Design a protein around this ligand. Structure first.
Ligand code: ATP
Ligand code: ATP
Ligand code: ADP
Ligand code: MG
Ligand code: MG
Ligand code: MG
Lengths: 322, 311, 336
């Protein structure tokens, strides 16, 4: 016995059905549509729609095999990969927070470049989708990062002196890697929601995409939005849609956040913005902050590893160690 | 009315009784049937017999207390959570047939506790367990680590993992669909005695309920109540151990910690566990606070110290 | 606009009964709000959202290769605005980007207003010499406009700019294409940037905006216990400025003051930008003009240094410059 409330039917048709004495989905399957339609005063089209929507409504070993057969996305940071278990995990939503100038955008560019590394070197060999909300995407920086990756991979392959490594690196050229990054631009949050809604079919046609980046999510939602409840509902819906998409399409998702100041008594602490309930949305959360002239990466929340602190650096080659 | 459900119904009487109402059998049972014999023309002796048999097959009959006592003496059971602190906190494990709710802050302990309990039940008792992951917070490497911490035989670990089933539901409708599918398949498979599921864990109910709430609408609250009713009937009418996790909110007027999803959801579970992180000294790591906020067999307000990094 | 969508008449009638206007306010609301207002089931609401989103954003696909190769179609990624000095241009690798906010910060006598005037002079040079062939907008929030300095700069322009052919400068009418505005309050500044700058930018009169001080109006009203309205105003101003700059492909330059530091990248420094992290989040390129007066002043000349604080594409570096009778000149061979 399945209640009608458990189905995504129209409120009007459900009101009519409960008026006519309908409370179970099982009894609906044994009645001709004409008789029920003339009894409840419902036209043929919506009756057929109700009939079809009613009709339409993986052991852990397989999960282990799937997790092991697909790798992580390397960040060119050995310690960060070690504390992440191998890099950014697929099927998981990741969040990055930090004060301006720490290097969130550099990390996003590095990930977009690295996601196309051939699997012979431990990569995923997939495309990337970059969504920009603040206009901080500079092509020259991406070119520099791609050239640095080219040089590093070429040196590693030459030192190892294999055979299939050279073949894999043959097609791994600047034009090929630059042609596999898809760029979108959103100004208002309505445009971001529209692009999110269009994402499923686009990923369906572009089945080789293995990365989705949304650089800047606090900016579209922190200005000219007085109603806090509406913002909370929109953010919850966006998080649910993003995790559903990431799991369905075998994707790694990275979101970028901004810090804010919380004042208690007479001392101030830097905390991530967008309220407290937003903390449950991200599967993995990282925080970048300054200490003297050193940059530190802290794993704040994660259901697989332990809290750690990592020293990283930004160089002309890009995101690196030390 | 419906045809073929009970004997004695004629194809003429069903359209004859159209005079009063057509909605449900409540028209037949909740009417003054004396006037029906002349309003439409019916035999008195057949009408009462039909009403009696229909009421018999379409209701429930009370069961004496002694019979229920005896049957629970041989049916119910208790399943340990794998943590001595929790076990001594809630009397050496949770009881099947009730609803257990775990409430905590972001990242405190909920998913880890659920995973460790599932690993214990799958290995220490050799029973099937279903996991409903909604927020994506379930990695198989954590389960493998817990199983390695328990035993070392590879085949034992594989067999224990083979009793764990995971389903993904990112909205209320998918969760309702999978729960109703489990209800149907178990109710149909009552004849057998192998492969049954005794514990089902919902990773997060706030993930699929919060978008519906907020505003002046009513459908979200009705859907939440329907999900609660389904979980309660699955736990009680079948004798299963259900564990769900929920978020925690900070009140505005009073500033006290309060479970999410509101007052209507506040009455749903029977046993409440609250997890908090110990600030200042002893922070981080596994060191955390476990408290009992609601129980039908223990006084509330008690305190207990537990760790989530020693298993 | 709603009837342009391809949809069955039932949902069109439901939307019309629901008091909807265009796709923007359809996407403004959420799922449950639409269910409550319009009384529709989930599948058709999802279909309507999908169709409206497809109509709004189109169906075009863009790759980074197209951005890199096609210079003319995407000037924002390649076109830059010169500062009038080759050393400064080398430090900035071409000059100011056309999209986003650039900030100058420093204490008094650093030389911010001189650089602003020089940029206002050089914006209207021909394309091949770094200019944009457009006017400039100047907003003053603290005091009067430097008239004599401007006149001297226009007079010295042939001397300062020597690479441009001499016969070309006389046709350039400098003072007639610079606009001056004055405001005296935060609300006045908000209203001005809301309903005056877009009018100037729409007609092509100017393609450059300069604010001589953003901290000056804000440091007078809001005290240390009113940070929320201050942050709201700062966010609104930054959003409006970024929207205008993106729409009209015109650089925006902001002049800022400094405070005393008594976690944000400033440890071995005694001064920091004034507004705070809320305003610092709205920026793209951050510079810091600094004059070291307490030391190395006995050598006889001031020591002025321009430093790049942060930028998505520029490494942290600094150079030296001097202010003379003809304008700001960078010292060759001093980049960090
Ligand atoms: N080896 C380990 N593996 C996994 N988690 C660990 C380990 N050691 C410690 N932890 C802790 O496990 C916690 C995982 O949090 P968990 O997901 O169980 O909480 P939660 O309240 O359910 O979170 P969420 O709201 O994000 O769903 C982390 O906060 C981390 O500190
Ligand atoms: N011929 C000149 N004409 C004008 N200023 C000159 C000249 N030669 C050198 N200078 C220097 O130019 C500087 C102009 O300072 P400027 O107006 O740019 O300051 P600022 O950084 O905007 O400060 P404030 O916060 O007071 O506005 C002075 O310090 C002055 O010494
Ligand atoms: N070409 C480069 N060489 C060296 N360092 C650079 C280069 N480009 C940018 N950087 C550094 O990388 C950092 C980028 O920070 P960014 O990603 O913009 O932080 P956010 O996105 O949070 O504002 C800057 O602080 C800058 O110093
Ligand atoms: Mg950035
Ligand atoms: Mg969790
Ligand atoms: Mg000045």
């Amino acid at each position: 016995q399945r209640d009608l409330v458990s189905f995504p039917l129209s409120p009007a048709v459900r009101v009519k059905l409960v008026s006519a004495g309908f409370q179970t989905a099982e009894e609906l399957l044994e009645v001709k549509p004409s008789e029920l339609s003339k009894e409840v005063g419902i036209s043929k089209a919506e009756a057929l729609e109700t009939l079809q929507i009613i009709r339409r409504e993986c052991t852990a070993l397989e999960l282990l095999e799937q997790e092991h057969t697909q790798g992580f996305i390397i960040t060119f940071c050995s310690a960060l990969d070690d504390i992440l278990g191998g890099g950014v995990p697929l099927m998981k939503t990741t969040e990055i927070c930090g004060a301006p100038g720490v290097g969130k955008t550099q990390l996003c560019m590095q990930l977009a470049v690295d996601v196309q590394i051939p699997e012979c070197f431990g990569g995923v060999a997939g495309e990337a989708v970059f969504i920009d909300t603040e206009g901080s995407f500079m092509v020259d920086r991406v070119v520099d990062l791609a050239t640095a990756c080219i040089q590093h991979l070429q040196l590693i392959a030459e030192k190892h002196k294999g055979e299939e490594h050279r073949k894999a690196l043959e097609d791994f050229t600047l034009d090929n890697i630059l042609s596999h990054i898809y760029y979108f631009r959103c100004r208002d949050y309505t445009e971001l929601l529209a692009q999110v809604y269009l994402l499923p079919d686009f990923l369906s046609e572009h089945s080789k995409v293995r990365l989705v980046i949304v650089d800047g999510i606090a900016f579209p939602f922190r200005h000219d939005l007085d109603d806090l409840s509406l913002r909370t509902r929109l953010l919850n819906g966006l998080a649910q849609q993003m995790i559903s998409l990431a799991n369905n399409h075998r994707l790694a998702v990275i979101l970028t956040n901004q810090m804010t100041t919380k004042i208690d008594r007479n001392q101030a602490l830097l905390v991530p913005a967008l309220g407290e309930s937003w903390g449950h949305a991200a599967t993995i959360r990282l925080i970048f902050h300054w200490d003297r002239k050193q940059r530190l990466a802290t794993l704040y929340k994660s259901p697989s590893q332990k809290e750690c602190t990592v020293l990283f650096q930004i160089k002309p080659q890009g995101f690196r160690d030390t | 009315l419906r045809v073929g459900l009970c004997p004695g119904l004629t194809e003429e009487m069903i359209q004859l009784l159209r005079s009063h109402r057509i909605k449900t059998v409540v028209d037949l049972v909740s009417a003054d049937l004396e006037e029906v014999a002349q309003k439409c023309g019916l035999s008195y002796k057949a009408l009462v017999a039909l009403r009696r048999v229909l009421l018999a097959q379409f209701s429930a009959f009370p069961v004496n207390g002694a019979d229920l006592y005896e049957e629970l003496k041989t049916s119910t059971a208790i399943l340990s959570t794998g943590i001595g602190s929790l076990d001594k906190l809630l009397d050496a494990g949770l009881y099947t047939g009730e609803v257990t709710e775990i409430v905590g802050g972001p990242g405190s302990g909920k998913t880890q506790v659920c995973l460790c309990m599932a690993a214990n039940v799958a290995h220490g008792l050799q029973q099937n367990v279903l996991y409903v992951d909604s927020n994506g917070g379930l990695t198989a490497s954590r389960l493998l680590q817990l199983l390695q911490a328990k035993t070392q035989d590879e085949e034992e670990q594989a067999e224990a993992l083979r009793r764990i089933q995971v389903v993904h539901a990112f909205d209320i409708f998918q969760m309702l669909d999978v729960l109703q599918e489990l209800r149907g398949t178990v109710a149909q498979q009552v004849t057998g005695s192998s492969g049954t599921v005794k514990v089902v864990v919902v990773d997060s109910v706030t993930a699929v309920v919060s978008p519906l709430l907020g505003g002046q609408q009513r459908e979200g609250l009705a859907l939440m109540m329907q999900l609660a009713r389904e979980l309660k009937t699955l736990a009680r009418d079948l004798g299963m151990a259900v564990v769900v996790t929920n978020h925690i909110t900070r009140d505005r007027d009073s500033g006290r910690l309060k479970p999410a999803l509101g007052r209507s959801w506040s009455f749903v579970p029977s046993t409440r566990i609250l997890l908090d992180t110990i600030e200042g000294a002893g922070a981080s790591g596994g060191r955390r606070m476990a408290c009992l906020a609601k129980s039908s067999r223990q006084p509330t307000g008690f305190q207990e110290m537990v760790d989530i990094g020693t298993w | 606009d709603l009837d342009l969508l391809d949809l069955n008449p039932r949902i069109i009638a439901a939307i019309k009964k629901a008091k909807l206007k265009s796709v923007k306010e359809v996407l403004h609301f959420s799922g449950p709000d639409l269910k409550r207002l319009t009384n529709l089931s989930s599948p058709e609401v999802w279909h309507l959202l999908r169709t409206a989103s497809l109509h709004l954003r189109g169906s075009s696909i863009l790759t980074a290769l197209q951005l890199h190769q096609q210079k003319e179609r995407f000037p924002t990624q390649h076109q830059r605005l010169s500062l009038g000095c080759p050393v400064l241009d080398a430090l900035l690798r071409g000059g100011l980007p056309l999209d986003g906010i650039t900030e100058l910060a420093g204490r008094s006598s650093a030389g911010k207003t001189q650089l602003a005037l020089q940029l206002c002079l050089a914006v209207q040079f021909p394309r091949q010499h770094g200019g944009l062939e457009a006017g400039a907008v100047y907003i003053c929030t603290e005091d009067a406009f430097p008239h004599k300095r401007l006149q001297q700069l226009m007079a010295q322009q042939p001397r300062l700019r020597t690479d441009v052919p001499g016969e070309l400068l006389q046709k350039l009418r400098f003072g007639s294409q610079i606009f001056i505005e004055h405001v005296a309050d935060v609300d006045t500044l908000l209203e001005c940037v809301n309903k005056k700058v877009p009018v100037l930018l729409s007609r092509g009169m100017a393609r450059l905006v300069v604010i001589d001080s953003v901290a000056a109006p804000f440091r007078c009203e809001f005290d240390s216990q009113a940070s929320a309205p201050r942050a709201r105003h700062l966010q609104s101003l930054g959003a409006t400025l970024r929207e205008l700059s993106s729409a009209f492909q015109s650089p925006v330059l902001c002049i800022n003051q400094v405070t005393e530091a008594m976690p944000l990248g400033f440890w071995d420094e005694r001064v920091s930008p004034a507004l705070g992290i809320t305003w610092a989040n709205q920026l793209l390129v951050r510079l810091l003009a600094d004059r070291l007066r307490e030391e190395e002043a006995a050598l006889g000349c001031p020591a002025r240094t321009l430093r790049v604080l942060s930028a998505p594409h520029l490494p942290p570096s600094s150079c030296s410059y001097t202010i003379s009778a003809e304008g700001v000149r960078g010292t060759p061979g001093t980049q960090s």
